[model samples]
Target: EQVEILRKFIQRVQAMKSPDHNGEDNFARDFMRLRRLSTKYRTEKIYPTATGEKEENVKKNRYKDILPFDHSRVKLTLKTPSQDSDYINANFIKGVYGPKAYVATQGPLANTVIDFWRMIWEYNVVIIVMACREFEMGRKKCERYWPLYGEDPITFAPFKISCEDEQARTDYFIRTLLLEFQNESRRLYQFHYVNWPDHDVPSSFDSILDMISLMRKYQEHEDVPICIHCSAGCGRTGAICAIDYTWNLLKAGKIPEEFNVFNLIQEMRTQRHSAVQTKEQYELVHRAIAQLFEKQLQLY
Candidate 1:
């Protein structure tokens, strides 16, 4: 009856010791090849174009490189037909199990924060796995989407989202949010891993594994897809999704002894382009899975 359960990449330091200068290039080429192989399936999945993308909805997208295919894009259900904005740069990612999907989206710019809340209400998203901080190394990886401590009850259009409580752990912060729509209130949790750097693995995979266990418990009754994002929503987001997918399948007794990390990522990229971004990230996935297997065995 196991229904579900779900990277430092410190190993990278040792790998970088290779005297060969091309080690970096060789590593990148391998991942580049994965994307190349996966490109054939770009339209294999149902990629819904953005609603009225060209004629009525010619709003410029945030990132030219990243766009949700129409098939999987998340539309604002509460927006008026003639509203100023109704689009959010997010996608509906199918999870490992049936109808248990996840939303892999980019962090909200200040301008899109309202749109973000709309998606939350529209989809009934109960859990958020924030993989990166608002800023890393002076680069703005993500904007401050949620309200600050004293600023409870921030109104983002029809919905009022507020941070009710927060508990900070060494690796992640568990935040409980109160959401109001139509005078009805609901609560959701956010698990924020604040240390994932740009373009690399985290300091430790141990914390991530622990977080996943807790997230499973929290999402036990959450029927909607969990929300996951980093910066662009492809790189770190993809790697984390792959880990969860593999872990879920393992508990469900469907994963192979040697998990096919590449194939899993290929499927994810078909839904959202360039998931699990770099060759280094590709290697990190392999390492993280091996670590997860060991940890799961010990826990069981």
Candidate 2:
């Protein structure tokens, strides 16, 4: 049954990759190849926005007489309303809440967030939060805070938000961030936030792997969870949590045997309406997980 499902998925993916159908042939190929590589190496699967080529290709071959691809049909097992005040209050009282609580405070400065981080660090909690670009650009400005704590904080900021030639600036920022992370051994959890318009944040599973690897190396003795944040801490943070949560489910055998994208989305929505704010973002999550599952089944 698994193999059959996988075969169908591969066929659909192949159909999506055909260049003649649209230009996404390369993207389809790249995505599949990356999945295969990650599974072979026992790593997680993560991807940012669908590349332009991939999106175009899907449109071209969308009408082709292939397997019915219902990207919008994810069935969510969990559901959370847009107003989760009660739930948050309950969790806050129970102390079962994770890192999400830390980012809810309002402030232009990182002071409140920083205090939250300090508390978590004191209690040996793993947290992920987004930092301001100014904080990142002025590394020296944050030096004082770093010394107050026994360990240096792992910071990940994406490239610049806007520029004259946006793509070029983005590319440069990505390359620079990668190099900086590589060179700085003391920085444990550095991440680049990709702010794509009308899309959830972008993160490569490969890049996340590198971040995890760095955290392991730099904070060997600590059990700090990763901190992920964006301006509102909804769209980008929610997407990351959704992906992370799905990966956790996969590891624990929590996902159902049947493929129901709507159910998955519904489940995610129950936890947070913004778990996947847009239709495309919702589908992207499903596709990423499906790709991961396909790769894993292949290994067995």
Candidate 3:
């Protein structure tokens, strides 16, 4: 139903003398148009977040409206003193790889950091993509859950974690974190991308691509889901999943022209409502695909 909007972009961009430049030129303006069109396609149906609304789990949610759908929310096997302790504002998003290709979760609240680590351990997650800063514009976006390098490890009940190494990249920061639980230890990578401004997109796509490449390079298991989070866990978080999932589709030999990014996002929304949260975020996904076409290189 929404493929026509994608075709409209193709037609409009193709008519320009310099197609690539025109595409870039129109992105800002096209954001509103695409957002309107995309909104129209959004279902009026409400998916339940009953678990998140429960008394015990209410404070664990970063935002009231950004709770995970009950059907797809990640269930915790770990025990807690609170009733329905397994509830977390996180969802399993299926993609090109498998049913739980990625876990889109909210920025951890002070009370929920324990569940965050529990999810990581239970899922066997090796790579974590923190798409937003701990604080942005003088506001705290996410809790600084892991200890800084050279600092003592932070304890979250049974779990203890510390940053072993901090490597500063051009657009992001990579931290080697060690998690110790019950005499067992596990190491994971946290790729923190802070360049993306809150409520706005990045200036360029190169850094995003590089970050995605590095994540793939370090991924220990192809089947394990990569945990990702931002403030509300939808906008920036969804953009990462959208780009990475589409990249995988391309790697699977799908042609760029046949890829419908609009529908791709719509599909993701079914699993995790409010994904790719804003119009600008939605447009970012489209621009990423267009950038892929401009490069015309093998992703694998």
Candidate 4:
């Protein structure tokens, strides 16, 4: 049903002609058409966010406006009766394989740092993709949730997180972390991408694609979900989820031509509101998929 809509949309874009009918120019026009198409997807449904808006949980959110949908929000299993409720500004976004394929969340605030680690421990998340920095444009986008290199391990109640090792790359950095909780310690990874700036798309799609491949290379558990976050947790985070989700689909015998980026993102927004926050981010998703296909063609 929606595949037909995507097929017709692609055909209509291909049918149009202009003076500069080159590859880049045609893709530009198609992106614009899709931007216009997104408004219909945005208002198609109304998902509730009542839990995140509660007075007790309000301070835990970085941005009050960008709350998670109640139906899909990640709840805290370790909740106190009077101290707090089972609420966090995060949502479980499914990939092609399973429901908890990814957890899209906001950058952790100072007050929510404990809750962030709690969620990480509960999900047994080994790979985390941090798309934003601790500071962007002189503003604090994400709190430093882990201990600094050569520093003592920081204890967030039941969890003690320490940076075991660090490797810096041109586009991103990787940290091997040791998490201790409940008398057991486990090793995990944090892939911190530094190229993306807030409120804009990355300059190149290849950088982001390379990071995702590297994350998968280190993935030991396929069933455990990867956690990803930017500032507000939608723009760059959403694009990353869409790109990774599409790649999984390709691996699971999905044809590239029949892929519907529109409906995929629309479904994502239902699970987590305001996903793919900007048209530029939406275009990033399309470009990332094309890059993946290009790499496949090169190998063949």
Candidate 5:
């Protein structure tokens, strides 16, 4: 079972989109390659380019910028005519290891909560992985999209989402959300990280790996995508995606003897623009992977 997952990781990475985007044949750690990538990410423009139509949509964008591209953006399967592009801020993001594809989105705005639920119902999604807080550094980072404390239900047009059970851990929040469409009811999982800094890497690789393992444990199949988000939905979201994937390969002994996170970060950026947006955050990936092996040796 582990080997199959490992094989999926390697093959998926090999088949990843933008195979030739960077033109680097070597993903191995060379001081020069890592240094070049670090500088490139630091100096690169935040937005590569946007078309006139895409730019027009930017006004509806929550951040007033940082629009999800029309090509890569995830949209709801409109069952009715009222669904328009004006609401919901999300994109479909793929991981290298799992057979599943994940949805990446900005933290829900007060007005967009309805559309967010619409997306949940449309995708038959079972798990949501949150990497930011409702408020951080005195700034409002995300909306309290789900009710807290009790069985209070949040109604968004056609659906009502309620919290069924809640568990709090040292590093994460686990919640089971019950969704209702008329009389139909379905449950979904949410794993929200409590310790991730606004712009820093998590201090616990073991805990983050466990979180990913738990995410897969509750998911039945890769057919349903995992939903994830942070403030802008790129920096922390990209780091979590990179770490979860590489750690899986490392545990299965699938990464090459010489693994390079620069390549993984490079791969992630191809899917989501400026994935691990900072150079420091990029270094954390390499550091975390090395720590994974150190702990293994210590345990033995």
Candidate 6:
């Protein structure tokens, strides 16, 4: 029995590192082998859930669960107060909720995080979604090598989606990129970052819903907090946060009429000071909130 187990483990490792075999074929072969070994060992059993419910029971609960929109899993980190002429304080670094959330800030904080504040002061929002690695190469080629090569360069601008393609673009973004990042950061932040590209402007509501779904999954897994940050953490971040909170309140049968923007701002600042770093981003958040509430009111 011990020799059989050792042989199976060696085979699994060999299959994983064998570059000659296609990934899918390697995976299928290894998976079947494991299944056969598990049967021999009589170790095939359902994974136990935290709630002690069967898989079917959990699936039913998921369908009826009302995900909370509040920052239940998010931990806001504020910058220390500073008064130096050259010193600048950021509103927030990153909020985390999972067990290893501290890992998100392990190394020297990236200087780009501070640059985000500078950009927020100038532009109402800063877009920092990860472009496809190929797209990033194209952008670099367009910016640097195009002048010398005199060749037509591919531009992400042309492929940018509008509200009409919002759902498709969103799906692509989540499926191809966001989930991978979430998986990579699972031991650290354990949350996903969903970037709402500027071109997909008209579907902020849909974007909010997508984020809530992500939050729901995190909660179910008891994963660390999730964070959504762009170039600047103010305009888009603030707008989405506000919209998500308001939507949650409405779903809970609470009148969103009394939702206080001032209180929201205060809470955000308290959790992560400088929640709106620039004056323009601060104002933009206010306007976005107003627009979102107006739409919600009309729906009522």
Q: For model 3, how many clashes?
A: 0
Please give, for residues 1-300, the per-residue lDDT of candidate 5 as tens digits: 433444444444344322244553233223245446544642464433343137545544557545565556666664533456543567666655444477778887776666777888888888999988999999998888888948588877677789989998769889999988867888998999878787776765567767777887897345778888888787888777777777656566666643556666666665555566554466555555555555555654
lDDT of 1 at 203: 66
Candidate 3 C-alpha RMSD relative to the actual structure: 5.0
Q: Which predicted model would earn the best TM-score?
A: 4
- The 10 consecutive residues of candidate 3 with the worst lDDT sum are 12-21
| Candidate 4: Cα lDDT at 105 | 95
**lDDT of candidate 3 at residue 283, scale 0 to 100:** 66
lDDT of 6 by residue, 1-300 (tens): 323333343344344434443544443443344334323332233211223133422322212221111222122232313211122212232222223211111001133223222222222221222211212223310011011122332222111111111223352233211111112211111122334343123333444455445544433321222343433233345444544454444444453333444456445443332343333333444445444445555654
In candidate 6, clashing pairs total: 5
Alpha-carbon runs more than 4 Å astray in model 5: 1-56, 80-82, 97-100, 202-205, 251-253, 295-300
Question: On residues 1-300, what C-alpha lDDT tens digit does candidate 4 reach at each position?
Answer: 434433454453344333263545544554455455544443554566778877888898898678888889998886533325578899999877678989999999987887887788888888999999899999999999888888989977767899999898768999999998778888989999999988788788777888888898887334988999998888889889998887776555464555667778878877776778776777678767766765654554
The residue-by-residue lDDT of candidate 2 on 188-230, one tens digit each, is 2333333333234344344433332343343332223444444
lDDT of 2 at 58: 37
- Candidate 3, residues 1-300, lDDT tens digits: the string is 224434554454443223254464444444454455445533443566788889978899998767788889999997744322788899999977589999999999888888898899989898999999888999999999988778998888778898899998879999999988787888999999989987789999789988987888898335989999998888898889998987776556654454556677767877776678766776677777666645544332
Per-residue error (Å), model 6, residue 285: 2.9
Which residue pairs collide in model 4, if any?
Answer: none
Q: What's the TM-score of every candidate structure? A: 0.82, 0.42, 0.84, 0.85, 0.76, 0.34
When 3 and 6 are scored with lDDT, the better candidate is 3
Better of 1 and 2 by lDDT: 1
> What shift in Å separates residue 132 of candidate 1 from its native position after superposition?
1.8
Give per-candidate clash totals.
4, 35, 0, 0, 0, 5
